[model samples]
Target: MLVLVIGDFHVPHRSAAIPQVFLDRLNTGRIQTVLCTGNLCGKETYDILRTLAREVHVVKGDFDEMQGLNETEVIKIGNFKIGLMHGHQVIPWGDREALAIYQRQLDVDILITGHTHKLETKEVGGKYFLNPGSATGAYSPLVDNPVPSFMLLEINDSELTIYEYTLVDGSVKCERVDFN
Candidate 1:
């Protein structure tokens, strides 16, 4: 199964749009699911995410103007129970302890969140934590310049492959990582 983790697009505000380099690949509808960390800032960005996948999962973000979205969400894909958050609620913003508590509360195998506008992926204990950063290179308080990024997960049973993509210096780069 192919799942996409993407968000933190402060489009038309912090960023005019997701860079053309990213949109070249993200415009595909082949992805089966999309986990968005929100902060999209408007319904238009959310609509764009919907066009990229069959099912789109979103959480409430501090700057989003959309309604009916929650502060956190959980979904199951392949062998992983995935949790999603916008990150602003975590006191120190991306603090591991707070994230860990939320992970335990959801009892998920993977937790995905974004707010800092910087990409990250790591395994804590036996679970995974991921942040896809800002798809539109939105400005963030934590970093001087946050590169646009997103993550794609290819999972089959217990095996997981993560494809992380980032836009740098007018080009898009991809790195792959595997998890058991």
Candidate 2:
């Protein structure tokens, strides 16, 4: 199964649109599910994600006032239980120890969050952490020029491959990591 993890799209508030490079690749329809860590800021951005996949899970971001959205969520895909959150609640935002606390609370194999507008993936104490950054490369007080990025998880049984796509220097770059 292929799962697309994305977030921090401040939309017209921070960005007018997703970069053409990211949009062109995302509309391929090869993705099966999409996990959005909110900050969509409006329905139009959410609509774009819906077109990418029918099964879309979204958590409420600090900037979101959308109805029917949860603060956190967990979904099972293949043999893994994935937890989702939009990490503004964490003190010192995006700190590993704070994330570990959420990992323990969620009891999930993979914990995904977005808030800092930067891409990060780490394995700690047998649990995986992923932050897909800002899909539109939205501005942040923490970063002057955040890269536009997202993650794709290819899962089969106990093995997983994480593909990170980032727009750099006017082109898209892909970085991959495998976990078992």
Candidate 3:
């Protein structure tokens, strides 16, 4: 199964749309699911994601007014239990230790969150942490010059591969990581 991890668009507020390069790839219909760490900022962005993937999961962000949205979500894909959240609620923001506290509460193997607008992946105490950054290179008070980025997870049995995509210097840079 292929799952696309993204969020923090701040769309129409920070950026008008997702970068054309990224959208071009997503429109290919090869993705099975979309996991978003919200900040989409409006329904229009949500609609775009819906059009791109069969299943879309969004966690609410501080700027979002989406009705009936959850602050956190937990789901199973392959052999991993994954936790999703929009990092604003984490005090001191994006700290690995604080995020790990959330990981324990959700009891998940991989925890994904966004708010920092910077891509990050770390393994701590046998648990994984991922932040796909801002898909539209949106601005955040926490950081300047945010980059547009996201992640694709390919899962089979007990193993998964992460393909991280970041837009840099007017081009896309991809890096791969395999996890078990």
Candidate 4:
């Protein structure tokens, strides 16, 4: 199973170019699921995600107006247990300890989340925790600039491959990891 993970769009404000270009690029790939964290405001964002993947999962964010959406989701593909969340309800924002507790509660092999709007991924206590960052390069003036990133996880039987994609300085930064 191949999945594309992206979040923290905060569109039409940060970057403003929207994610069509990147989504279009993704559409050309062999992705079975599309997992988005949160902060995607408006109907268009939902529509874009729907068009990009056969299976799309999204959680509501602080800026989102859409209601009745689940805050967390889990799907079992092949041998991989995939968990997805926006990470807003977890306190001590951006702390791995808090996320670990949340992950334990969810009990998935791979956990996906975005709230800090920065790129992060690690294997802790036999589970994977991932933060794909703000895909639009959105940022508060008081903070450091965002990297504009996302992640891709490919699962084949017992192996899971993870990759991070970041857009900055007209170049995209990509990093990869593998888990068995």
Candidate 5:
């Protein structure tokens, strides 16, 4: 199974749009699911994700006030139970303990969140957490450099591969990791 994780666009506000180079790469097909960490700002952006996959999950962002978005979402894909949330609700912002606390609270195999507009994959309490950062590279006070990024998780039975993409100097760089 392939899961696409992305969020924090803040489009038409913090940023105009995702760079063409990055957007083009995302157009590749075969993505099975999309998990957004919120801050998309509207439904139009959600539709774009919808084009990628039918199973699209989104958590309510601090900047979101629209209907149908809940504070959290939990979904099971393959052998993994994933918890989704927008990180603004996390106290003191993006502290490691703060996230680990939520991980315990949710009791999920993995937790995914976004709000800092900075991409990260963390190892917390034997579980894992991921943030796709800002797909549009939206401005954020919490981060000095906002590099547009996203993640794709390939899962088969008990193993997983995390493929991370970040745009740098007009080219998108790819990084890979195998996580247990």
Candidate 6:
């Protein structure tokens, strides 16, 4: 089961071009589930996600104002239970401590989130955590390089692979992790 993960799309403030490119890839049929970390801000984006995949799961981010649930979400994709959250409210900005707690609580095979707009993926304390960064290249109070980026999570049975893509040249700047 392939699950596509993305987040921190602060649209109408950052580059509007990023979302369309991301959407184009989503329109392809390789994905089985779509899990997002929120900050979609409006209803239109949410609707777009719904149409792009067979199943869609999302958790509200700090910038989101549309009707939805905040905090975290748990979704089952082909026997793999995945946890989704926006990590703004957590301490230390991408620290392992906050994420570990969430992972244990949800008991998910993988965890996905975004807030710092920096792409990251790792396995800590027997749980997987990922941040797709800002797909729209939105500015932040932290970090110097706010390069536009997003992530794709491919899962089949017990294996997981994360692919990171950048916007500046549409180059894949980083390849973070893979678990089997």
Clashing residue pairs, candidate 6?
Answer: none
Q: Model 2, residue 19: displacement in angstroms?
A: 1.3
TM-score of 4: 0.90
lDDT winner between candidates 5 and 6:
5
Runs of candidate 4 exceeding 4 Å displacement: 11-15, 19-21, 140-143
Which pairs clash inside model 5?
none
Provide the lDDT at 139 for model 3: 82
How many collisions between residues are there in candidate 3? 0
Clashing pairs in 4: none
Question: Candidate 3 on 1-180: residue-level lDDT in tens?
Answer: 899999999844454458899999888948988999998858788999998888899999888888988999998988889999999998778877899889999999999999998998888988889899999888888888888899998989778788999999899999999888
lDDT per residue as tens, model 6, 1-180? 767787777744654445466667768847777788888847767887788777888888887877756678888765578888888877776778877877788889777878888888788766778887887777777766777777777777777778877766655455656677
Candidate 3 runs further than 4 Å off = 11-13
Q: What is the lDDT of residue 56 in candidate 2?
A: 93
Superposed model 1: Cα runs more than 4 Å off: 11-13
Q: How far is candidate 3 from the true structure (C-alpha RMSD, Å)?
A: 1.4
Per-residue alpha-carbon lDDT of candidate 5 for residues 1-180, written as tens digits (9 for 90 to 100): 899999988844554587777656667857899999888858788888988887888888888866889988888887888899998989889888888888879878888999998888876667888998998888888988898899999988768788999988778898998976
> Candidate 1: deviation at residue 29, Å?
5.7
TM-score of every candidate relative to the true structure: 0.94, 0.95, 0.95, 0.90, 0.94, 0.86
Candidate topping lDDT: 2
Evaluate candidate 5 by giving its C-alpha RMSD to the native, one decimal: 1.4
Model 6 residue 105 distance off true place after TM-score fit, in angstroms: 1.8
Give a tens-digit lDDT track for model 2, residues 71-99.
99999998999999999988778889999
Worst 10 residues of 1 by lDDT: 11-20
| Candidate 1 TM-score, true structure as reference | 0.94
